[PDB]
Amino acid sequence: AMSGPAAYASYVVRGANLVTAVSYGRAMRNFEQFMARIVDHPNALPSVE
Amino acid sequence: AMSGPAAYASYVVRGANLVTAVSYGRAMRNFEQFMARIVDHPNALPSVE
Numbered sequence A, B: 001a002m003s004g005p006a007a008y009a010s011y012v013v014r015g016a017n018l019v020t021a022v023s024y025g026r027a028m029r030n031f032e033q034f035m036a037r038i039v040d041h042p043n044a045l046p047s048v049e
Helices: A015-023 A031-040 B016-023 B031-040
Strands: none
Touching: A015 B031, A031 B016, B016 B031
């Protein structure tokens, strides 16, 4: 007998993802994560943990 | 005799234009001015004034 999740994981294009979605190619999974890098906290090196 | 402008008009990719700029091969003209039409005040009919 094992364990695990009991639901799925949502994916919504709310926010400024929608603005990139309509007039372009697409939007971004992890957009808040993506905005956290290049404007919010740049020049960080790729660390696993 | 005439009056007129005295300088140019700025165009910077500051803000979320840069976020689209690194990933996708485009950037808007005043992303906020484009943001207000689609997510802030949608379906406003286009009028000249």
